Amino acid sequence: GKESICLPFNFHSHRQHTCLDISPYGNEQVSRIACTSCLPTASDAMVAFINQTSNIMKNRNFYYGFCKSSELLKLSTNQPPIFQIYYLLHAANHDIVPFMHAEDGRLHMHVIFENPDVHIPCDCITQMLTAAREDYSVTLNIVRDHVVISVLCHAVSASSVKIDVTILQRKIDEMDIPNDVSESFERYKELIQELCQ
């Protein structure tokens, strides 16, 4: 590929018009023009955030990461970028497992990639950066031989929209958790502990 990157990779290091390519052979950034592997905008993802309660099942993979915590879910409703960043990553890569964690009164998200080969399209990165601007760090690392994108919130700025929290909590409480989703969290128990600590 075109150029090695150092891990952990903070997305503030993103070179315009490049994709990230992670494989067992190395960690690289490549020209989007030259990329053989190569989506919604941050605005689209904000509309989806606004419309969450109309799309609970559609966004079920997101809500599993809360592990039925009403407290975490409430925090998410004050922080659109958590949902926005998941939504963007999910569009480019379905084989992901997000886990949410609160620290210092703020919600943070770790997105665990199931497969060892991971391509992050340029168009995904640029939209994540829009969603993350100022108040979040977004970093890619390999942790326990898994690619993980960590979304850490430094400050929670006022959101100028309100979600119906009660409706959202009720729908999340009612969701079934499939066996394979519970199993994946158990698989990743040591990984999740490392990320959170």
Question: Which residue ranges make up the site for Zn ion (CB under 5 A)?
Answer: 19, 35, 37-38, 121
- Give the span between the Cα atoms of 18 and 20, in whole angstroms: 7
65 contacts a second copy (rule: CB under 8 A): no
- Work out which of 13, 159, 166, 182 binds a second copy, going by CB under 8 A: 159
Residue placing its CB nearer to Zn ion in the complex, 1 or 121: 121
- Strand order in 9-10's β-sheet? 9-10, 136-143, 146-153, 106-113, 96-103
Binding mask 66-85 for a second copy (x = CB under 8 A): --------------xx--x-
Q: For 135-168, what is the HEC assignment? A: CEEEEEEEECCEEEEEEEECCCCCCCCCCCHHHH
CB 108 within 8 A of CB 159: no
Rounded least distance, CB 54 to a second copy, Å: 11
Cβ closest to Zn ion, residue 65 vs residue 121? 121
Q: Is residue 46 a contact residue for a second copy (CB under 8 A)?
A: yes
Q: Is 134 in the site for a second copy (CB under 8 A)?
A: yes
Min dist CB 16 to Zn ion, Å, is 13
Cβ atoms of residues 88 and 184 within 8 Å: no
